[PDB]
């Protein structure tokens, strides 16, 4: 059960210069966070990472995930969240389940912030909870998928 | 450990006439879901459920945790989140964890329902995950909690 | 065949102060008139009437319709027309016939008075006629029952 | 004791092609239900029909009643509601009654249709109600102007 | 087969004096146009032309068309496009197929003309092509025509 | 030397109400007053008057205008002003000078007569002098007109 | 001579928490604070103290004062002065000086801040100058009555 | 009958650059145009002619108007049309007729030159004539006066 | 202990006209006024009136106060409220109490009076109490003074 | 003679996952559509398809075009439409016909989609005509060719 | 070769407080840095320094900049860069190089200083070196008149 | 000492067509400039230069200039500037100073150009200057760094 993480521009920044606003944690601390979430609940989950500052890239891997054995994605789109009709299109065709994770709270910010085009194309939106975050979104992820497939049945 | 979960106008008529937007699942049903989760989970945590239409109650009882033995708040205050300034300030004045909550992706509704006062006052917000975001609030919740104590030793 | 009548904020003040816009007749005066109207064309109707000035009130007097014996709802929502989400709400889950009136023409007034977010969830909306408006309700409300229930058959 | 009714643009189109918001009966039918209740109450009441789709039409026809005798005005600018300053400057130039209907709920539509110029300008305002509206109307008309007479005496 | 050409207020003086930004060709001029495409390429289509300065004459030909043999309608509905919800609403009940044409750009030119009401209630809109577009339109309306017979059969 | 005195909607029901905002001197008055103004200066001008309530008459009689012997046109658009794209293009293919009048001062008014959309096709604008406003129009006509002819020497 | 002071939603939180922007003042203490001020001048006023975070209970006590001996009401609507028509509208049916107080300078905080409903329906708004501002409202209060009685005689 | 001719920042500079859209005539030059229609019309006028670039100083001057036997103002008050209120309540106080004129037609400019606070202030406005518009001015507030002192007698 | 204070654009004009808005009572009597209410008091202060209609000229004289032993500015900026960023920083840099004042309550006017960059600058505002509220300024600038020298020692 | 078809994000996803909005056809099919319809038209152009993800790759690709043998660009940027300034710029710098096309009826979408940057540098916009729209632009390309040639000679 | 260098309202004030936002440097400083750059380069440059609260003193100056041997001037208008039309007006008709310059990156601040008239009237425009901005100007000017002499040989 | 130049979309594209607004300058001629001045200064700089129109590009250079010897960023984001706020939260975490560019005034140009995200996050902006703004961006860029290093000792 194949878990699509993807990290919008600026995330690999994230911690090596501790830039106050976002905090401490690298990128690769976040994922490694994730693991180890995945192991200490024996979920049935294998994470695959992806990074990019392209808008491109993005759509591009969203895209990818459609024809494969890809189960779900957790996204934190970054500052596109608040620009990119077209990742919220590319979200919208994915046809399987699309989480979007904020470290920072996002409504608590500036004004160009507070909409997020993505976030109305997912079906759910976490923010404001730091790496934590991205935990939440998989054990809502779980529980989607969980109630998908029970229904099949 | 307590946390006081506060519900807002209108959540009270969940389900029971199955009015599409908001589901089949009773708010009772709803906080069955959370006491089974923190049972299941075996976290150290008492609840108190509370839901009213009154702005007023819900400033009411943010304060009245005040003083108390209340750890933390998980709140959804339903049409109040884009009009009520007042609870918003309540929020503010807490001097504890509040996590929102909304059933529905609010971002992806009407203009008027976009805004949130009081998720912008809240730490983190969660929404569009139907009854299982309470559950999402309750993990941040407890994890929020640790931390917090993990730092006081 | 139960009608009830909601009356929101300060429209209990009507009258008593002569206070110019609103007019000389009291609240009680225009349920007065309301009841004349009921008999003195014999319609089949008992009217509940209810005046308060809390938002919440209205909310829970609009929901314990909702099992009850009460067939539709006429309302002056007042000033919270404008403003109430949650009042909008409330009506759109009545299950029943709303009818909105307004003794003033809100259409003429100030800017802020314009929208009316209740009178939207309403299935139709009076105003600028005075008391009168109340009584074009009550007929409305007749023949909106009549039909619903000629259709029954 | 004349009263006109004027029908604004594509309101004579009703009914005809079934289209759905504003229902199946036509603006003919519309018209033998007013006379219907005018006769079924025993209005002391002659009505003059008039439809156009041209704004200089709808002025021309408000213009034409100040000098007659005719006694007030119940009208449906239709689209003309929202646009027309120069049909609400008539309406103001009228001196008598004048009554504005909807059909449809014209707060609970597009945005551009929660204006209307003509609406400001009329004693008020009924919306709504679908053909029944007209009839509410003919009710108030004959009270506004029973209560103008009495206190002439 | 026959086709409706509606040309709104002010097009009948294109061209006469050259006045730069529409361009040197007279609206006859674009009518014949029209024929000679229709007859090089053997279209089984008569055209009837219609040009007005009257908001209320389009609305009548558009709905005179209703009951006709008239298979589709091609306008350019002139300046009226971006304030008339009148043949807006017109054109939705048309029930039948309508394309908008304009001479120029109407989203590189003022503000107050990007907006098209009309536009947004049509199939399709074709701008910018000076007198082709409407011969592009002609194409686009025996395409959609052929199309909605062949379904038909 | 002919001038064309167009006339919008509902200024032919001037002064006969008193209706307090225009004053007491009726549509006729006015051009009595004009004429007075030409004989008395002995100019030497003929002047065609024009009331209309329809926006396609007032287009008609601008463009009729064109090929003629009209030198001028002097305007007053009435509420058409605010809203009317259409006679502004009239106006702006009139190739003859136009000048627009208000009785009234059109900036210190409600915020949707403050636009003029005519005026700003128009070479001038004159508010707010009450029927002499025409006069001055007249006079700026004249000098407008024998500065265009001296000039051709 | 009675006033009656209004406290609106969470000013009964102040200064017990220190929560920096209100101060460290309570609100108990505000009250002190005003008594003595009544006593060190000798003005002949007795002080009713109210305070609540419903904005039902402002309203049912702005018209609580109408039939009594009340002269005059200062009050601070919190959180409500921004979003309260219904508190606006008690204010202007209070027939009597109602004075608005703010602790701090709401000009100078958010935009969503800065509007006062309940302060354009007072006669006159204090904003500020913390604790102060309420004894500034006394001092006004006291001369304003005086003025009103003065007159009478 | 003296009257105050006052003109704002930057028409000294007229002219002298030609700088195209105000066109070829000095400052000067439209004083000497005024004199001059003043002498060829007998007007019983003496003119004082004012220019500044200060907006205190145009205040200054309306303010020195009010003791003196200055009958009446025209007054260009160019970029601080815009801008200046203090100029507009200025205009307010003046207690005597006061003639806004504007070389340029204000209403075909700029969004930001559209809005005249000033000219709102005052009892009439002349816009886009050129020079010609301060005589046009002149005609005006001689009838203007005229009729002051027509209606004292 | 020195108190300025500085008058607006327009003040000077004050009750001279009785201009009704802003009352009967002249600029010179609201200083009297002040003086008055410093002696009753026996409060500790001189005051310097300063009444200009430049803008430069306030800004000159609140950085006139900063070098000196001027403790305080009580200022009515006048219709510069709204416009002047100047003014407003000035205030800013005055490291000194300024509290502004308003006779009218700029709430309840025009919107583009609703804004004071002044005001938002100064530690508090006082408006709608006519001339009594420079009294108020008074009063709350002896006590803030007081109070900042309290803690000095 | 050379024509580049740029196609933007996500429509490469057409009509694979059938997602109702857009229909059916997927884009190779529309680009043989597109083939089809040069070859039953004898049209004498060869094309060169291209579609991405990138705003990037839409920018070069328009560059490209510069230098070379490229006669036309005809482009859906597909949500870029209304975002991109950037491809807005490269469109004007391209110096040949750009035309834009859209499936759907952009105008009668969600407000963030009727604004299109890159439609208002085309010279011509066609939407909402499905895959016909394409068609349409090669026969509006081939004639803007045609006539560009013709002046040539 | 004469540059003038003028400093708008406040810019006196600099350094003299520290007042942080704009730094320890006060104006005569910021001259005497230049002086400095001027001849540790050996620049053909004469300064002329002028700094000013009043809006109408920087456009006199602009203004007596016209006729004389002034080459060019480096402008800082400070709070009136965001509100000064006039200003903006003058620096259009100064016919020679005008350079704005800004301490602080506008850009960076509130919404109300973003805006700049001024700038947009400019040639160019320089923000946020603080005192080394004044320099960069003076480089540029001298570029700009070397530039503009070259071309004339 | 090390600076990267950074051009965004279509810069690349300067000269080759002399397409007016932007010049005949090349940008390879712009970075010859560059070299020259830096050469004719003995300054001591390494330039990198770098081109691209990928958003992407832009962001991955700034991030890629973090852990390396690069002391600083001029940039010129070209369109990017007015959208992108992935490319401003570059820039903010950058830690090395950042100039922003701009061969044009943006804020003489459309209102979709004056807003710069990209520029509130530089410590400073220069636009207007033509290919001499980054000569201008050079030498504060060298006395900025010379700032930053002359303090740590
Ligand atoms: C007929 C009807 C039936 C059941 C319910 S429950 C309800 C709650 O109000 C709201 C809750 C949210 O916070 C949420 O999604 O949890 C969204 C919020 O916008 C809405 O007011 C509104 C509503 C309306
Ligand atoms: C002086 C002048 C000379 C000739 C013409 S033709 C004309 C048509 O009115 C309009 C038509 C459009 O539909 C179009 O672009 O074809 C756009 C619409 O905005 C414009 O008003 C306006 C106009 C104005
Ligand atoms: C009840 C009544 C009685 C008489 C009249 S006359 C009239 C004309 O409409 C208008 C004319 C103006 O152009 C003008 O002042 O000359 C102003 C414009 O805003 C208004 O629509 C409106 C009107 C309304
Ligand atoms: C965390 C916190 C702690 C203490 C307090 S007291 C309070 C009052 O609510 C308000 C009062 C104002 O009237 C005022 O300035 O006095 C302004 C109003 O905007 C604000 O909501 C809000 C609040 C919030
Ligand atoms: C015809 C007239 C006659 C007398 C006066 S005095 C005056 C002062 O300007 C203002 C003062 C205020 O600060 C206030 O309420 O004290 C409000 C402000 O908006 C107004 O411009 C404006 C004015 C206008
Ligand atoms: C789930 C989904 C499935 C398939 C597709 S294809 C697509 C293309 O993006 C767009 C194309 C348009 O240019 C058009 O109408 O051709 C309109 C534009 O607003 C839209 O973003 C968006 C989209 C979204
Ligand atoms: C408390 C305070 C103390 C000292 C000073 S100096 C000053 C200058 O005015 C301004 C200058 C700018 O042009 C600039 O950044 O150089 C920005 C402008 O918005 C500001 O008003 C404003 C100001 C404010
Ligand atoms: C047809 C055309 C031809 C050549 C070029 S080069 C170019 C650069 O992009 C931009 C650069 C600016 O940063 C600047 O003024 O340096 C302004 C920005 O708004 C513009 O997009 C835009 C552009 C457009």
Do not use: W
Not at 7 to 28: A, E, K
Not at 61 to 80: L, T
């Amino acid at each position: 059960m194949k878990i699509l993480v993807i990290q919008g521009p600026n995330l690999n920044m994230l911690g090596h210069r501790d830039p106050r606003l976002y905090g401490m944690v690298t990128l690769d601390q976040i994922h490694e966070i994730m693991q180890t979430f995945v192991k200490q609940g024996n979920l049935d989950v294998e994470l695959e990472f992806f990074q990019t500052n392209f808008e491109g890239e993005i759509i591009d891997k969203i895209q990818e995930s459609v024809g494969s054995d890809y189960e779900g994605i957790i996204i934190n789109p970054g500052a596109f969240s608040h620009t990119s009709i077209a990742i919220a299109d590319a979200i919208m065709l994915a046809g399987k389940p699309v989480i979007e994770v904020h470290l920072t709270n996002i409504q608590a910010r500036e004004e160009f912030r507070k909409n997020s085009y993505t976030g109305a194309a997912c079906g759910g939106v976490i923010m404001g909870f730091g790496p934590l975050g991205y935990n939440m979104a998989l054990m809502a992820m779980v529980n989607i998928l969980a109630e998908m497939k029970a229904f099949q049945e």
